[model samples]
Target: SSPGIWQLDCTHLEGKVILVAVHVASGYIEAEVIPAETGQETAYFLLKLAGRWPVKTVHTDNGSNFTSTTVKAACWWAGIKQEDGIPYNPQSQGVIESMNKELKKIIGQVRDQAEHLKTAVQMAVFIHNHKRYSAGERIVDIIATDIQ
Candidate 1:
C-alpha cells in the first residue's frame, strides 16, 4: 500500500464542523473544530497538515465542500493530488472512519455541552496519538514530542 496519503472529511457535532485528516501510513490524525465548511477554512486546515508532513495526496469524499475550486487551488499549489476514488464513494478512503468512531465514542459518553465537546476533541486527539493499537510505535515518536 502506498503511504504518505491522507484521508480528509468533516463531521458536524455540537454545532461545529470538525475537519478530520488521518495519515494512512502512520495513523497520525489531525482535526480542527471550525465554524463552517468553507473552502478557505478547509484549505487552511489542509495546508496546516501539509506543513507538518510531506503530504502527497489527499483523499476526500465528493462533497462540494471538498471539491470546491478553492480547495483545489490550494492542492494545486501545495503539490497535493486530490482523489475521490469513485463518485458518490465517501467510504472509499476508509481511514477517517475509525478515527471518527473513536472520537464519537468519547463524545457520546460526555455531557451535552459545546465547550465539553471541544475539550473532549482535544483530549481525544491527544490520547489517540499516544496510544498504539498493534504493539507498534506512534507517529509522535518519529516526528514530534508530546505537547498541547
Candidate 2:
C-alpha cells in the first residue's frame, strides 16, 4: 500500500461517503457514491466489481466496515487478497489518498456550481478517467486496451 501500490479506500465529502479503487499501474479508477456510512455492503459491492477489474488484491485503512466479518468472508469467497494499511499513516496508501484529494477538489467545484451531487460525482469520474495521463494514454484507454 505504498505510493507505487494499488489499493482501495473510502473518503467522505459533503456528508457523502464514496468508495474509490485505483489501479496504480494504469491509473484506472472505480468509485461508488454511497449515501450511508461505508460498511460490509460497500466492500461487498466493490469486491464484486473487483472481479471485472480483475483485482488481485485489495488494500485499505483500518475502517471498521472493512474489518467486519462479512467483508472478510466476501473477500475469502472472492479469492482476492485483502490487507489493511498501517493505522494513522496514510502514505502507505498514497495512490488512493491522492485520488481522494482530487475527487474532493472536483466535487467542491461542482458543488459551488450548484450541480447535482450524484451526477457531478459521476461526471467527475468520467473526466478523471478520460483525462490524458502524462504517459500519453488516458485511464479509460489504458483500461480498455488491457481488457481487450
Candidate 3:
C-alpha cells in the first residue's frame, strides 16, 4: 500500500521528505517532513500548509533553503516578518534546535539502512508526535489541539 500525497499545514514545518522539520514549544513539538530542499516549489508547498495561520514571523539561518528568494517572497506576502539567525549562533532557533536533537536521537535508535532512513525518520516523527511527551500528551496531538 502507498500513502497518498497528504498535505499537512502547521506552525512548525516548512517542507516534506525524509527530513522531519520540528518546532519545540515548551514540552510540545510541531513537526512535518519536507520532500525536497528549499526552492519556489518548497515555498509554494509551505504556503499551502501555512493557510490561515495568520503568520506573523518566519525565521531561519544561513542555510540556502532559508535564504531563497521564493521563501522570502512567500513570507512577505503573508505579512510575516522574516528573521535571519546569526551565522554560527547555536541558540538562534533554540526551539527547532532542540527538536532536531530529539529527532536525531529517534533516528539513531531506528538504525535503518541509509536508503530506508527516510521512511524510518517519518515513522519515528509520527510516533513521537502521537506518543505522550513530557507535556502529558502526544506532541503532535498537543500542537494540533492547541491550534484548533
Candidate 4:
C-alpha cells in the first residue's frame, strides 16, 4: 500500500475542512476535506446525518473539540450514548485511526495536485464510501442492529 500514507493534515491549508463518518462496524468510511475548521456547526450537520438512522452509541477520541459543550449537548439532546475512548490507547479507537490513514492518502493526492480543496474533497468522499473491506461482525454491529 505504498508504505501507507502519513501526516495528511500537514499538507492541507490551515483551517481546511475535513469531514469524517464511519460505520464503525464495516469501517465503511464517509468523509470530505473542506476549507474550514470543524466546529459546532459541523457537529450539528453530522448529528442530522446520524439521525437518518438510529445511533445509540457514538465512540470518539479524547479531542476536546469533540467533547465540547456543543457536541456533548447535541448528543445528550438526541439521546445518543457517547463513549470517549481511553486516552493514549489507540487500540480502543483503532477503527477510526486506521480509517484516518486512508483518508490521509486521498488528501495527499489532492495536496500534490494543488486542486481546489472543496472539489477534491467531494471526489475523495465519493470514492472512499465505495471502498470495500471485510465484515468483521463486531459486537457493535450486532448491538446497532438490535437496539431499538
- Tell me, by lDDT, which candidate is best: 1
Would you estimate the TM-scores of all the predictions?
Answer: 0.75, 0.72, 0.53, 0.62
Give candidate 1 regions above 4 Å deviation: 85-95, 108-116, 133-148
lDDT of each: 0.70, 0.65, 0.48, 0.53
| Residue-level lDDT tens digits of model 1 in 10-117 | 778879888888776677678788887888888888888888776788876447745689889888888898876352555543545666777777666553544556
Q: Tell me which residue pairs clash in candidate 2.
A: 1-92
lDDT of 2 by residue, 52-97 (tens): 6556666665567558777677777776677775535655456566
Candidate 3's residue-wise lDDT over 63-106, tens digit each?
56467899778767665565654525565356546556676677
Candidate 3 residue pairs in backbone clash? 15-33, 15-34, 16-33, 16-34, 16-35, 17-33, 17-34, 17-35
TM-score of 2: 0.72
Q: Provide the global lDDT of candidate 4 against the true structure.
A: 0.53
RMSD list, candidates in order: 5.2, 4.2, 8.8, 7.5
Error of 2 at 53 (Å): 1.0
lDDT of 3: 0.48
Q: List candidate 2 stretches off by more than 4 Å.
A: 1-6, 87-90, 93-95, 111-115, 133-148
lDDT of 2: 0.65
Determine the backbone clash count of candidate 2.
1
Give the worst 10-residue stretch by lDDT in candidate 4. 1-10
* Residue 111 of model 2, lDDT score: 64
* TM-score for candidate 4, residues paired by index: 0.62
